[PDB]
């Protein structure tokens, strides 16, 4: 303590007396004197630092600032940090001697201003340090230096999670709204803020709402159910509080669900997949030149059990690269035509293994268990020594290794997993080496054609299938329960940002608690993309738009939620009845006609009792197996029928589609009589908008963003104007077969020229750039840049048009708005986290009186609710007397944290910076009222209270663009403001940077123009 020296400062900091006291300590130093003493250039130079420290002469020698004392412990620290900072200015002085700054001054007026902050940073850091400790229960007496780095990964994680609450909160406001008026119109479930009604909002898009009715969050009269407020909100409000506060404690004692509602989630994760054969969009049937082998995978069989089948061993994500690696690792096969179409082969390959892994472990002993072995027997054999095969090695071994993991050696858990992965690759190469065998086949299109041929063959392709077992998801916690709901209401781009943080926090703590929710998150992601990849493309298919719009208009007439097998049996009774009576020829069914109810009998649950019948005998001849296999069959054919209803409705909308049909034409239609051949085979086929319009994938998915009419605007005119001849006139078409691959091909090989980097990269360039020519990439006259750069500029120009045409720019902008808002939302949740460190820190120094705690309020600092009960009714820290609040606020106002209510965090609604970002308006209502550069500035100024948050956000935001443009990481260190002037400030980001020769790259410029246009636009 130390603990005191902070307390002294606050009394002064609030009272505006440190500034005078800081200024006077500088006059005594004495600051003016030194520069005359050494300033004019430092000597010959010379310019040797050694000559300093004159300062000791300056301060020793102050002269000595008198004898030590009498200032007492407290004022010596001000002189101590000033000497520290005056060294810093003198540390800056000699940055001129080696450059091209100038050299000039440290005028007193400036120095105090810089110094005031260092003092303010000094005490605020310690306050939050005591705050950070107390908040989480940490002990100052014994604290590890490990226990921090194990805490930095939770404190780091908590922000990505808290924002996951904020983004979900947004997704429910898109489908719900206040029943009756309030001061602030955006509901805050997890507030908790539990209330009436609330009530529904426009009944579309029906993607979210099917989820929200699937879980019983709506009584399909569309009146929010009781479970919504009793569970969903009441859990999230508890779980969101566990995070904001640091709560280590048992899970609110017991919690819902009683595992009957865990199943409500799991059934959702099942019924968002498609039949093993709804899915040939992978174009498995094209395997074509092979193979029965797919057929071989199905035949082996497996069963469900109480526990421990494929549970302990690593999740698939970890064997994904090596199964991916081995096909690539072999050179047996050669590079495909650019993918695009290379992917289609790979995606089938990845999919197959995902199932192959799943089969092998659920496998029961097969036949006599020979020859080659069931996969576990062989795993167990590797783990055991010779003659010790069998027994429960896997169940025990993982547990042994958690005990091994528990001890602290952080590679223990990981070592076991790496042992299983490697065995699988060994298990796969011996038994299924052929599987990766490749002809491969025609490169593309011609490879296509076929893919096409199966299509329009309504009669069977005949398409192959992979026997699809069914999923065993499990939710052990309540924490794994809402995260699984939250992902069922968010974007893939939003799930992926928290999934990769669940994973990144796993490797940091070396723990694996989060390993199951990852797999659930990795699960939900993959079921969405297949459904956006399978259904849209050549499924229902775009074509004959004017006609297809009619069909979906007909599809309008009552559909709601996913529906129980017995609930299906009651609803289609006469149809099931009539279908059974037409299958049983004996006049026994005459009795069975009327008494079919009761005599057969949520998810089936089928049986024939059969009782409540009295004529068993007449009824009896029918038998049992043949009837409970011919209803159970029937519901199999009237539960996929309503599943394809899910696809026609939902993903395809009559209103969604029209927007596509309208939007394209504005690009197509002529500006005069002229008949525009261009956009032929690009938007439409040969016939004329007659019409067929080819699927442009990036347009459909982004329709009804909504709205994107602000996003499409940045690309609307640039598309129409561009001379899109990419297919024509065969000058170009060959450009794709050879030129894009060839030019692209040439560079990477060149790319691989390093090593050596130092001057083979520099030297080789000069030889091809400047002298004669060399033919390393021999066919094209490599080097002879006159013949290459000219060659390059033609492949650059074609690609640049193709990103405009294919609406690819619709995605970068839609993902800039997600990425930019997220990394700003994290700061707002970081600021509220930092608030708890200040209030616990101040109280711990006795500077502030707190009464008690107000669980379920979340916010650390009181908002001025009307009128006079705001210090206790509205905050977590009840704060005692009002005077205790007014002191708290002045201290905060001492730093850059105002709680005043004039500006800028408690501004009405949406004026507030915090409200605009935390409710996620940058992505849902971009370009209105406030720019994006204006908001990035407002965030950082709010976080200017700590010196280590300096330029924190400006860099956090700009790594979004790190892949599309090359940043100027040395311009991110000066002091700048984006929104206020400085449109020519970037500079910060400069054009990409394509390849080893510093080839310009296409599109590098546009994105720089687009990334900027995004930041300043305001409508």
Curated annotation (Swiss-Prot):
Effect on the protein of changing residue 952 to A: Wild-type cleavage of target RNA and pre-crRNA processing
Please list where the region (Binds crRNA) is annotated: 56-59, 83-87, 114-118, 145-152, 496-501, 947-952, 974-975
For region Helical-2, the annotated ranges are: 280-471
GO term, biological process aspect, one: defense response to virus
Instruction: Specify the effect of residue 951 to A.
Output: Wild-type cleavage of target RNA, decreased pre-crRNA processing
Usage in biotechnology: Can be reprogrammed to target specific mRNAs in an E.coli system, which might be useful to create specific RNA-targeting tools.
The UniProt annotation places crRNA binding at: 92, 132, 402, 508
Q: List required co-factors.
A: Mg(2+)
Region: Helical-1, residue numbers: 1-141
What result is annotated for mutating residue 948 to A? No cleavage of target RNA, no change in pre-crRNA processing
Positions of region (Linker): 543-806
Q: Which residues form the active site?
A: 89 (for pre-crrna processing), 92 (for pre-crrna processing), 240 (for target ssrna cleavage), 245 (for target ssrna cleavage), 914 (for target ssrna cleavage), 919 (for target ssrna cleavage)
Q: Where is this region: HEPN-like fold 1-II?
A: 472-542
Question: What activates or inhibits this protein?
Answer: RNase activity on target is decreased by EDTA. Target RNA acts as an activator for non-specific ssRNA degradation.
- The answer, when asked if NADP is one of the entry's keywords, is no
Instruction: Enumerate the residue ranges of region (HEPN-like fold 1-I).
Output: 142-279
One molecular function GO term is: RNA binding
Co-factor remark: ssRNA target cleavage requires Mg(2+), weak target cleavage is seen with Mn(2+) and Ca(2+).
Q: Which stretches are annotated as coiled coil?
A: 536-563, 604-682, 737-767
Domain notes from UniProt: The target ssRNase active sites are within the 2 HEPN-like folds which interact in vivo. The X-ray structure in complex with crRNA shows a crRNA-recognition lobe (REC, residues 1-498) which makes most of the contacts with crRNA and is essential for pre-crRNA cleavage, and a nuclease lobe (NUC, residues 499-1389) which also makes a few contacts with the crRNA repeat and is responsible for target ssRNA cleavage. Binding of crRNA induces conformational changes that probably stabilize crRNA-binding and facilitate target ssRNA recognition.
State the function annotated in the UniProt record.
Answer: CRISPR (clustered regularly interspaced short palindromic repeat), is an adaptive immune system that provides protection against mobile genetic elements (viruses, transposable elements and conjugative plasmids). CRISPR clusters contain sequences complementary to antecedent mobile elements (spacers) and target invading nucleic acids. Unlike many single-component effectors, this CRISPR-Cas system targets RNA. CRISPR clusters are transcribed from pre-CRISPR RNA (crRNA) and processed into crRNA (optimally 28 nucleotides in this system) by this protein.
Also noted in the record is: Part of a type VI-A uridine-preferring CRISPR-Cas system.
Family, per entry: Belongs to the CRISPR-associated endoribonuclease Cas13a family.
Protein name as catalogued: CRISPR-associated endoribonuclease Cas13a
Q: Which organism is it from?
A: Leptotrichia shahii (strain DSM 19757 / CCUG 47503 / CIP 107916 / JCM 16776 / LB37)
Its lineage reads: Bacteria, Fusobacteriati, Fusobacteriota, Fusobacteriia, Fusobacteriales
* Covered range of the whole protein: 350 to 1383 of 1389
């Amino acid at each position: 303590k130390k603990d005191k020296i902070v307390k002294f400062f606050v009394e002064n900091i609030k009272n505006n007396s440190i500034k005078e006291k800081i200024e006077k300590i500088l006059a005594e130093f004495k600051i003016d004197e030194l520069i005359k003493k050494l300033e004019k250039e430092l000597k010959k130079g010379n310019c040797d630092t050694e000559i300093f420290g004159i300062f000791k002469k300056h301060y020793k020698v102050n002269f000595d600032s008198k004898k030590f004392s009498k200032k007492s412990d407290e004022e010596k620290e001000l002189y101590k940090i000033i000497y520290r900072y005056l060294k810093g200015r003198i540390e800056k002085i000699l940055v001129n001697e080696q450059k091209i700054e100038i050299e000039k001054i440290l005028n007193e007026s400036i120095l105090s201003e810089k110094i005031l902050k260092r003092v303010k940073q000094y005490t605020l850091e310690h306050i939050m340090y005591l705050g950070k400790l107390r908040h989480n229960d940490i002990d100052m007496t014994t604290v590890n230096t490990d226990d921090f780095s194990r805490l930095h990964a939770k404190e780091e994680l908590d922000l990505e999670l808290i924002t996951f609450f904020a983004s979900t909160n947004m997704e429910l406001n898109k489908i719900f709204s206040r029943e009756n008026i309030n001061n602030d119109e955006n509901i805050d479930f997890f507030g908790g803020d539990r209330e009436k009604n609330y009530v529904l909002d426009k009944k579309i898009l029906n993607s979210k709402i099917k989820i929200i009715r699937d879980l019983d969050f709506i009584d399909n009269k569309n009146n929010i159910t009781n479970n919504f407020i009793r569970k969903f909100t009441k859990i999230g409000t508890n779980e969101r509080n566990r995070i904001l506060h640091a709560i280590s404690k048992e899970r609110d004692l017991q919690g819902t669900q009683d595992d009957y509602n865990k199943v409500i989630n799991i059934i959702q994760n099942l019924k968002i997949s498609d039949e093993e054969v709804s899915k040939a969009l992978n174009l498995d049937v094209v395997f074509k030149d092979k193979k029965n082998i797919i057929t071989k995978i199905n035949d082996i069989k497996i069963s469900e059990e109480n526990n421990n089948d494929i549970k302990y061993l690593p999740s698939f994500s970890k064997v994904l690269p090596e199964i991916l690696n081995l096909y690539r690792n072999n050179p047996k096969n050669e590079p495909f035509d650019t993918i695009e179409t290379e992917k289609i082969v790979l995606n089938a390959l990845i999919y197959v293994n995902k199932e192959l892994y799943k089969k092998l472990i659920l496998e029961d002993d097969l036949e006599e268990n020979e020859s080659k072995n069931i996969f576990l027997q062989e795993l167990k054999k590797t783990l055991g020594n010779i003659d010790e095969i069998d027994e429960n090695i896997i169940e025990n071994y993982y547990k042994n290794a958690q005990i091994s993991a528990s001890k602290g050696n952080n590679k223990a858990i990981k070592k076991y997993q790496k042992k299983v992965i490697e065995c699988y690759i060994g298990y796969l190469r011996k038994n299924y080496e052929e599987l990766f065998d490749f002809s491969d086949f025609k490169m593309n299109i011609q490879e296509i054609k076929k893919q096409i041929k199966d299509i329009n063959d309504n009669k069977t392709y005949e398409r192959i299938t992979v026997k699809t077992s069914d999923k065993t998801i499990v939710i052990n916690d309540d924490f794994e329960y809402i995260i699984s709901i939250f992902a069922l209401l968010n974007s893939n781009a939003v799930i992926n940002k928290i999934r990769n943080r669940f994973f990144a926090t796993s490797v940091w703590l070396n723990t694996s608690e989060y390993q199951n929710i990852i797999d659930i998150l990795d699960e939900i992601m993959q079921l969405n993309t297949l459904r956006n990849e399978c259904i849209t493309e050549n499924w229902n298919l775009n074509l004959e738009e004017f006609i297809q719009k009619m069909k979906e208009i007909e599809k309008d007439f009552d559909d709601f939620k996913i529906q129980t097998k017995k609930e299906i049996f009651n609803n289609y009774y006469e149809d099931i009845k009539n279908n059974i009576l037409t299958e049983f020829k004996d006049d026994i069914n005459g009795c069975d006609v009327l008494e079919k109810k009761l005599e057969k009998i949520k998810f089936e649950i089928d049986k024939k009792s059969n009782i409540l019948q009295d004529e068993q005998r007449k009824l009896s001849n029918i038998n049992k197996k043949d009837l409970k296999k011919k209803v159970d069959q029937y519901i199999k054919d009237k539960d996929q029928e309503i599943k394809s209803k899910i696809l026609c409705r939902i993903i395809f909308n009559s209103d969604f589609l029209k927007k596509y049909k309208k939007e394209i034409d504005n690009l197509i239609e002529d500006m005069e009589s002229e008949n525009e051949n261009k956009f032929q085979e690009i938007y439409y086929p040969k016939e004329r908008k007659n019409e067929l319009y080819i699927y442009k994938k990036n347009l459909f998915l982004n329709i009804g963003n909504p709205n994107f009419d602000k996003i499409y605007g940045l690309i609307s005119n640039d598309i129409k104007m561009a001379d899109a001849k990419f297919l024509f006139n065969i000058d170009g078409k060959n450009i794709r077969k050879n030129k894009i691959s060839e030019i692209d091909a040439i560079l990477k090989n060149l790319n691989d020229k390093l090593n050596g980097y130092s001057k083979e990269y520099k030297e080789k360039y000069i030889k091809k750039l400047k002298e004669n020519d060399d033919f390393f990439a021999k066919n094209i006259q490599n080097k002879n840049y006159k013949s290459f750069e000219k060659d390059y500029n033609r492949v650059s120009e074609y690609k640049k048009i193709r990103d405009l045409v294919e609406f690819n720019y619709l995605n970068k902008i839609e993902s800039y708005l997600i990425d930019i808002n997220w990394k700003l939302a994290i700061q707002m949740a970081r600021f509220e986290r930092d608030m708890h460190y200040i209030v616990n820190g101040l109280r711990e120094l006795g500077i502030i009186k707190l009464s008690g705690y107000n669980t379920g309020i979340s916010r650390a600092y009181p908002k001025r609710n009307g009128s006079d009960g705001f210090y206790t009714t509205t905050a977590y820290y009840k704060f005692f007397d009002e005077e205790s609040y007014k002191k708290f606020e002045k201290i905060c106002y001492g730093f850059g944290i105002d709680l005043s209510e004039n500006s800028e965090i408690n501004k009405p609604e949406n004026e507030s910076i915090r409200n605009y970002i935390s409710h996620f308006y940058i992505v849902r209502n971009p370009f209105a009222d406030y720019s994006i550069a204006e908001q990035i500035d407002r965030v950082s100024n709010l976080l200017s209270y700590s010196t280590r948050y300096n330029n924190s956000t400006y860099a956090s935001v700009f790594e979004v663009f790190k892949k599309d443009v090359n940043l100027d990481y040395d311009e991110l260190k000066k002091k700048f403001k984006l929104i206020g002037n400085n449109d020519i400030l970037e500079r910060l980001m400069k054009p990409k940077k394509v390849s080893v020769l510093e080839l310009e790259s296409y599109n590098s410029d546009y994105i720089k123009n687009l990334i900027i246009e995004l930041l300043t636009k305001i409508e």
